[PDB]
Structures are given as C-alpha cells and as structure tokens.
Amino acid sequence: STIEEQAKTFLDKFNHEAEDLFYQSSLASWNYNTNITEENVQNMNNAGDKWSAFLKEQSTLAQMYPLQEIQNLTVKLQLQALQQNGSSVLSEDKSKRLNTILNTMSTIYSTGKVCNPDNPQECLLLEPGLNEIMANSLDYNERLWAWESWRSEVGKQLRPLYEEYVVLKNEMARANHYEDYGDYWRGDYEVNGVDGYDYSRGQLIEDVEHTFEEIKPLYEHLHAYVRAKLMNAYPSYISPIGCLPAHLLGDMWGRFWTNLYSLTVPFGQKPNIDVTDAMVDQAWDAQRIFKEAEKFFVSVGLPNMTQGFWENSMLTDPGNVQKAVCHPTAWDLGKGDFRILMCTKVTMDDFLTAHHEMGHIQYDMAYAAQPFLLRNGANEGFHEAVGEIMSLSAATPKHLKSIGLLSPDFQEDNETEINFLLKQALTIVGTLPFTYMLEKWRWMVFKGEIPKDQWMKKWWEMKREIVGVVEPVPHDETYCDPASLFHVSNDYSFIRYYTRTLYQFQFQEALCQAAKHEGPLHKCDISNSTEAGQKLFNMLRLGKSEPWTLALENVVGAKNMNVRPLLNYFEPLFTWLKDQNKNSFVGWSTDWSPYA
Amino acid sequence: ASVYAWNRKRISNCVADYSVLYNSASFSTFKCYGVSPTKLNDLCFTNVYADSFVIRGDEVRQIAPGQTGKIADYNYKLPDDFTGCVIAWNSNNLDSKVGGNYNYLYRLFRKSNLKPFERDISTEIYQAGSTPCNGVEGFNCYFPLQSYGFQPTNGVGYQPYRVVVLSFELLHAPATVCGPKKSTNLVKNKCVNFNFNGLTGTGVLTESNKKFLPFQQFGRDIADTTDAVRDPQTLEILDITPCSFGGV
Amino acid sequence: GNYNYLYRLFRKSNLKPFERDISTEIYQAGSTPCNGVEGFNCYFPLQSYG
Ligand SMILES: *[C@@H]1O[C@H](CO)[C@@H](O[C@@H]2O[C@H](CO)[C@@H](O)[C@H](O)[C@H]2NC(C)=O)[C@H](O)[C@H]1NC(C)=O
Ligand SMILES: *[C@@H]1O[C@H](CO)[C@@H](O)[C@H](O)[C@H]1NC(C)=O
Ligand SMILES: *[C@@H]1O[C@H](CO)[C@@H](O)[C@H](O)[C@H]1NC(C)=O
Ligand SMILES: *[C@@H]1O[C@H](CO)[C@@H](O)[C@H](O)[C@H]1NC(C)=O
Numbered sequence A: 001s002t003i004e005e006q007a008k009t010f011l012d013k014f015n016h017e018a019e020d021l022f023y024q025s026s027l028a029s030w031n032y033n034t035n036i037t038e039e040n041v042q043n044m045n046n047a048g049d050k051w052s053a054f055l056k057e058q059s060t061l062a063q064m065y066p067l068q069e070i071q072n073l074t075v076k077l078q079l080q081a082l083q084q085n086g087s088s089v090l091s092e093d094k095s096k097r098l099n100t101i102l103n104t105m106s107t108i109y110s111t112g113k114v115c116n117p118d119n120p121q122e123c124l125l126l127e128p129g130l131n132e133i134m135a136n137s138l139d140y141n142e143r144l145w146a147w148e149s150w151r152s153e154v155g156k157q158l159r160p161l162y163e164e165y166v167v168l169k170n171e172m173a174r175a176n177h178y179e180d181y182g183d184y185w186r187g188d189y190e191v192n193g194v195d196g197y198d199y200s201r202g203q204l205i206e207d208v209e210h211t212f213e214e215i216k217p218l219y220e221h222l223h224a225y226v227r228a229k230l231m232n233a234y235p236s237y238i239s240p241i242g243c244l245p246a247h248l249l250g251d252m253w254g255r256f257w258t259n260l261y262s263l264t265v266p267f268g269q270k271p272n273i274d275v276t277d278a279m280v281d282q283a284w285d286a287q288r289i290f291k292e293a294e295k296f297f298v299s300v301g302l303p304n305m306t307q308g309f310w311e312n313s314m315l316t317d318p319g320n321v322q323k324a325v326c327h328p329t330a331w332d333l334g335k336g337d338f339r340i341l342m343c344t345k346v347t348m349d350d351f352l353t354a355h356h357e358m359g360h361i362q363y364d365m366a367y368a369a370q371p372f373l374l375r376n377g378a379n380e381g382f383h384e385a386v387g388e389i390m391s392l393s394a395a396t397p398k399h400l401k402s403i404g405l406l407s408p409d410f411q412e413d414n415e416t417e418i419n420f421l422l423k424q425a426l427t428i429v430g431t432l433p434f435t436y437m438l439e440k441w442r443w444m445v446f447k448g449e450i451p452k453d454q455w456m457k458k459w460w461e462m463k464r465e466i467v468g469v470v471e472p473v474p475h476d477e478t479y480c481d482p483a484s485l486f487h488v489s490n491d492y493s494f495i496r497y498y499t500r501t502l503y504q505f506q507f508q509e510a511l512c513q514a515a516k517h518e519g520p521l522h523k524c525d526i527s528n529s530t531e532a533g534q535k536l537f538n539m540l541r542l543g544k545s546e547p548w549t550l551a552l553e554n555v556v557g558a559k560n561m562n563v564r565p566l567l568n569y570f571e572p573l574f575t576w577l578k579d580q581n582k583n584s585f586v587g588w589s590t591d592w593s594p595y596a
Numbered sequence B: 001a002s003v004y005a006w007n008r009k010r011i012s013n014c015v016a017d018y019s020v021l022y023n024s025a026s027f028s029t030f031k032c033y034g035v036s037p038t039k040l041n042d043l044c045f046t047n048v049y050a051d052s053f054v055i056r057g058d059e060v061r062q063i064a065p066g067q068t069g070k071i072a073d074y075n076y077k078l079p080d081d082f083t084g085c086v087i088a089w090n091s092n093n094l095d096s097k098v099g100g101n102y103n104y105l106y107r108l109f110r111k112s113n114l115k116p117f118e119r120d121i122s123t124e125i126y127q128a129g130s131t132p133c134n135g136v137e138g139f140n141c142y143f144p145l146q147s148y149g150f151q152p153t154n155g156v157g158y159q160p161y162r163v164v165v166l167s168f169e170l171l172h173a174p175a176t177v178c179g180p181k182k183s184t185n186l187v188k189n190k191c192v193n194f195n196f197n198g199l200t201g202t203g204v205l206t207e208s209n210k211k212f213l214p215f216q217q218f219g220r221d222i223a224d225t226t227d228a229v230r231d232p233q234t235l236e237i238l239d240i241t242p243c244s245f246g247g248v
Numbered sequence C: 001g002n003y004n005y006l007y008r009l010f011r012k013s014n015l016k017p018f019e020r021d022i023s024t025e026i027y028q029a030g031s032t033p034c035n036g037v038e039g040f041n042c043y044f045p046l047q048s049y050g
C-alpha cells in the first residue's frame, strides 16, 4: 500500500519489456550499417518508430508516481529519466515538425558537392573528395575556393529553417518545468535528493569558467610556436606578428590540427617511429589485430571479450556490392550482445582506433548487471573519456618497444619525445578552447537573451578574440554558417569533449600513482598492474546508480573538477616553449596595429 | 516445459547409469550439493523425481539450495539441505531462432513467496496497489507472465542453458533402485571370493550332473550351508564347493 | 569473525589416528587434475571459522 513498493513493481516490468524492444531496434540498426539495401531503410524505420512510441506510453504511467517520498536513490534516478515527457507536451500539429525537419537535414547533409559553378567536370563524396584536398595540397587559392564551395551551397538553405527551430524547442523546457533548453542538457550532471551531496546545475558553469584561466597560458605558447614553422611554406603570404588564417588549421573548422604535423615538424632530420612498411613484409592479418588486444586486457585484470563477437562482427571489407558506411561508432545492442563496426586498414590511425573503440565495449559490459535504465555511463563524458585513456598508453614508445614492433636499439633523446608529445598537444590542448566557445555560443541562442540582429555580432567577436581573424570582406545576416557543423546539426552535446580531456588525464595520474611508476606521465604504462584494475573497475561498475560527483572522490579525493593534473603532463613542452619564445610577442589582443 | 510449468516424473523400477554423465564432456554446471558423485554409485536413493525447466544462462547459479534471488523465490523454490545435483548444458544451436524465440515464459510477480516443492500455474494477475483489476489493463495490474527473447546472436549470459534437476531423498518406502556395479572376469577352479546378487562366499568350482529349475537364484543343502549359485549373465551353471582346508 | 583457527575440510584417504595432517594439498574429486590453479573441482580444503 506504499508508492515505494509500487515503483519497484513497475521498473521490474519495464526492464524486461524494454530490453526486448531495444534489442530489436539495435539489431535492425546494426544491419543498416553493414548491408545497405532499399528495404533495410524501411526495416530500421519500422523498429525505431515502435521503440519511440513505447517510451511515450511508459512516460505517462510513471508521471502519476509522486517523487517526494522515495528515499531510495537507485529508483529515484530511474524515475527522473523515465518521466522526461519530451514530445508528449507538444500538440499533434507541433509533433509533426520534428520527424519532418530532422530527416530532411540528414539527407541534405549527406549530399557531397565540391563541383565548381560554371565548370562541371567532376566532384566526389566527402571521404574521397574533401579529405585529399585538405590533407595533402599546399595551395592558398583553391583552399579559399573550397571555403566558399561549402559555406555558400549548403548553409544558405538553413537560414529560414534553423531560426524557426530555435524559438519553439526552447519553449518546451518551461512546459517541462526546466529553465531553458540549454539547462535541459545540464540535467545529466544534476544531482538531487541527497543532503550535502547535491550538485547544482549552475555550478558546472562556474567550475568550468574557473578552470579556463589556466588553459589559456598553455595555448598562448602553442600558437606562437606553430606560426613560425608554418611561414616556411608561405614566405610572403603571412606575417609572423599576428594570428593565423582559418583555412590553414587542418580542418574546415580548425577543430583538429593533425595535418599541421608534416608542415610544423620540430626535428624531421631523424626518421619517425613508423613500422607500417615492416608489417606488410611479414603479412600481418586482422586476426592478429584483435588477438593482441584481448591479451592486453586480461593482463591488466579486465574480463576478456565474449564468444558472441568474433563469429558475428565483420573485420575486412566484404564483397564488392556492400557499400555500407563504417563511420566509427560504438554499439551497445543489449542482452550481452557487443559488436565493433569498423573498416580495418594497415595504418597508424586505424590501429589506434581499434584500441580506442574497444575500450567502450569493455565499459559497456561492466555495468551489465545494472538495470536497463541505469545501463549507461555516469554522465556523457565518462563513456567517451574511458575509451581514450588506453589510446594514450598504447601510443607510448615504451609500449611499442614492449611488444617488439620497434627496433631493440632505438635511443630516446629529447627530440624523439617532443615530436610525439606535440602531436598529442595539437589534438588535445588545441581543441579545448574551440569546444567550450561553441557551446557557449549555443547557450545564448538557447537561453533567448540574444535578439535576431545580435546573432552575428556576438559570434564574430569571439572569432576576433580567440581565433584572431579580421574579415577580408563584410558579410551580412543572410549567412547561416554556424549551423553547418556535423555535431550541432545532428543533435550531439558538444560539452562532452571539453570534459573528456579533464577526465582522461585525472584518471591517468590516478592509475599511474597506483602502479607506482617512477617517471613522468608520458612514459607511464598501465599494463602488468593488477592494482590499476581495481581503480578502474570500482568506478566502472557504478554506472548511473551513483552520482558522478562520488566517482571523482573515488579516484582523486577532490570533490570538485580539478584542472591542476593537466599542466603537469605538458611541463616538458611548456619549458621548451618558454625558451623558444624569448623574443617573440607572446599573447595577442585584437591587433590592427602593423597593417592599419 | 517452462520454469512455471515444470513437470515432475517419477523414476523407479529401473537402472540409472550415473557414470556416463560424468564423462559426457558437455555439461557446464555439473555440481552436487550435499552428496558426493562417488557415494551415489555403490549405494543409491529412491524417490528419484526429476524436474525439467529452462533457466537463463546468467541466473543458473540462483538455482541452488540456500541461494536466494528471483527465480528461486517465485518460480522454483528448493528445500533446505537438498540432497541432489544440478546438471546444465548449453542449447544455443537448437533452443533459439531468428527474430526471438517467444515461447519460454516465466512467473515474475507473485503475491506470496513459493514454499518448497509447490507448482503454481494460474492466470490470476498481480496486484501492485489496492485497486482491484477486473481483467482490464491499468496502472497497477502488471500482467505477471513475461516471455524471454533468445536470439541466436545474444550474449553468453542470456543464452538459454538446458538444465535439469534430480532430487534424492529417503521416505519410509523400501526397495530403492540403484546404480549398476561393474563386473569382473571369470576364473575357474580356484578358491576365490565371490559376491553374487545377495550372497557372498569363498570356494572352488566343480562340475555337477544334477539340474535345477530355472526360477531359483541360489540354494543350500544341509544346515544352512550355501552350495549352489547360478549367474544369469551367461545362462551357464557353475556350482561352488568349499576349497581345501585343514590343520597342519 | 575470528579468522585465526582453520580446519581440514576434505581429505582423499583416511589416515592413522593420532597423526598430524599438515599439508596444503588440494582435493581431487573430478577427473581434471588441478595444478595449483583454483578451478571448478580443486576444492581448497582450508577454511576459517567465524
Ligand atoms: C609486461 O608483461 C609481459 C608478460 O610477462 C612482458 O612480456 C615479456 O617480456 C620479456 C622481455 O621483453 C620476454 O622475454 C617475455 O617473453 C615476454 N612474455 C611473453 C609471454 O612473451 C612485458 O615485457 C611486460 N612489460 C614490460 C614493460 O616489461
Ligand atoms: C547484402 O546486400 C545485398 C544487396 O546489397 C543483398 O542482395 C543481400 O541479400 C544482403 N545480405 C545480407 C546478409 O543482408
Ligand atoms: C534503496 O533500495 C536499494 C535496493 O538495493 C538499496 O541499494 C538502497 O541503498 C536503498 N536506499 C536507501 C536510502 O536505503
Ligand atoms: C507530462 O505530461 C503530463 C500529461 O500532459 C503532465 O501531467 C505532466 O505534468 C508532464 N510533466 C512534465 C515534466 O512535463
């Protein structure tokens, strides 16, 4: 006759019903990404519609349970996630603009076009067409043409569509008793119902802003060094007194600077650590890629992979007619079914991606004993950061020399480690200010305290401050260039990448201290340490059943979001950068001084 | 049959070979509780009632004496100090089908805990709250019966493991059925010990001209001295005589 | 639990009384031998009372 015993009855009924329907939808989605046919698109839409309609019925039934008397926290977190109304608050005339708009955007984004107007020779898709012209060529004129080949042909038809999207989805939050739609995404970090352990939604903004004043002095010296090793290819085209152009920072958006390593190598005289030519002489197969990965995990202490993965997944590119996309994604089909979806290649990146995507699988089965609603990460940043700490360890020269891929006599001087470490600095430190600023821009358009005529004047004023680019020609309000990026268009929370770095290095220092490694963090290793397994495994089994703020106290002992154990990784790089920048003007404001 | 409709058939008046199961090299949870595999061979126990049901792989360990959980509490409760063994083996290649095998159901919700050795087959629906349910689905009816989904690609834990349970107990009923005792080779004309079906002794074998009726087992001649046996294995007569002995 | 007094749980054979049985050997019930690695049939006899 109590509500507490009635909720446990409903969640026991929902757990068995949902895991049967979720497996059917996940299996249909798995077959779409391996065997593309005309009927398979309809097969995926059939299962996905009945899964979304199943949550509509369960959300209405859980609404009548009052939340003011459930002292248990395991079922309180389950009822908070299940009672999210979502689209049920909206009317029938308003719910039909969701499935229509979201499917038109995905099909429009899948159309690859780089054919120049009035000269229709040919143009390929994104993977064969766009990546070779951005990663290999060193011509200023055509890359400037390529910037207007995408920002003037796809984003022009989004200006009446995206502005209608951001004024009515924000109103749903007040109908769901939230503050704004930006506050809705902060509910994953929200903890309530525990006295003295509560984490406010607004505390994440204060803690994130306090940690940004030590990222900046590391990034000032990184940008100053890279502008001197970039002017070799462009002698009279960029001045070494200001900032860098936007279309020369590796990607279209400048998120990853991986393509600048060849241009800005510190010491290219000695040969790099490359064994790609060595494995093809001895015929290394893809069976061997997963066999050494399996014995790596069982030596640490983690359980090995199940028998329902090797005979079920695909490894090479099969057949000739199967044109299915193999974008790197992690699959959690449920009911003990775990798969890896990738196209294998004998390259540097695919071998590391093979290590990166397996770590999410080992995290997924860890909370397999948890109920279905709690069968997830502690937040959106845990499940991504766990899969990247093993990528840092596998790329170390000590681990490469441990297996025997590298030569037994390979000296480790100063320059053999700074070249490797600066590649990691360009892909980790350089993406932190870009990730936080874009989500900060998304926060103001979602809060609604930005008028129609003030979209561009706030977006452009941080590009002048952070990136440092003066507009070569004035541009009006008809452009809709901020909505062109892949994550913002496909409804992905981008704050999970800012918190990914601060989590993947808090755990790295904690496990290295557990293994009692004598040396710096770049040479540290995780393998051959059963002491490190208990540190990871105690926090993996929690899932969403415990608050994420208790997971920090389980590893570092500090309840807040610490930024100190990130500068200690780059102390060897920062002290060299301080000596290299003895005479250069480090730290730019907005600067029209030299060429006013 | 399913766990909620487990059958109970009596095994008696027959011979059971427990040695073949030991060397099957196919079982996964061949465990014996309260009894050793060796001690059940020489001596047996009557009341060999067998229970058959389907148990999910991850919850196989729940079915054991003194072990509580979900299946052991509402579907099949074992009595304390259960003198028996549990044998389980995989059935992935036959007890599964594409699209989900929605044929195995189980009882998830019960108002009261199940007492040992009681089968509850009923269509009554659960009562989570206080409002009665008159057969119309509502917010607190929660139809108990649920169907498992056994796809061929499911994980090891969710695979339906084929498990059976054997119960050994002693009631006042006499005349139990026991496991067979290995035989030996034959020896002729030697003062050798023997243990026939009921009687044992020592002596030498010799031919005899007389014949006995076919419905006897042994016999005695004078003063309760056993002097005749006939093994039914070969349907040939061998007669026993005491071997030489005396005082030196 | 006073986990300081232990005892022998199984032994393969019966020994002569008034004889000390001080050994860390593991029981062998199944046909698969155990070589110091605990398994499904090693049955480490030693246990501590609570
Ligand atoms: C981590 O443990 C493994 C397993 O012992 C070590 O691999 C051994 O390395 C030595 C010397 O390199 C070889 O002689 C052995 O043959 C290796 N073992 C096997 C099974 O091949 C590995 O070296 C250890 N890691 C480090 C950094 O020492
Ligand atoms: C794979 O796709 C082809 C056509 O693209 C189709 O003929 C074939 O039946 C598919 N096979 C499977 C196993 O889906
Ligand atoms: C609520 O019940 C769960 C069930 O296991 C238990 O783990 C949890 O500690 C309980 N909460 C409180 C506050 O007692
Ligand atoms: C969800 O919808 C129901 C029915 O319209 C309503 O009673 C409830 O208050 C809503 N809850 C939220 C959080 O919007």
Ligand SMILES: *[C@@H]1O[C@H](CO)[C@@H](O)[C@H](O)[C@H]1NC(C)=O
Pocket (backbone or CB within 6 Å): A304, A305
């Ligand atoms: C996986 O681990 C289990 C338990 O350690 C072990 O029994 C099994 O042999 C392992 N699998 C392989 C392929 O080695």
Ligand SMILES: *[C@@H]1O[C@H](CO)[C@@H](O)[C@H](O)[C@H]1NC(C)=O
Pocket (backbone or CB within 6 Å): A412, A413, A414
């Ligand atoms: C690295 O630099 C320091 C400082 O100049 C120098 O003393 C040291 O010898 C260098 N390392 C090697 C291997 O020469």
Ligand SMILES: *[C@@H]1O[C@H](CO)[C@@H](O)[C@H](O)[C@H]1NC(C)=O
Pocket (backbone or CB within 6 Å): B232, B233, B234, B235
């Ligand atoms: C049982 O007796 C019969 C006699 O007809 C014999 O043929 C058979 O071999 C005997 N059983 C065994 C196992 O030898």
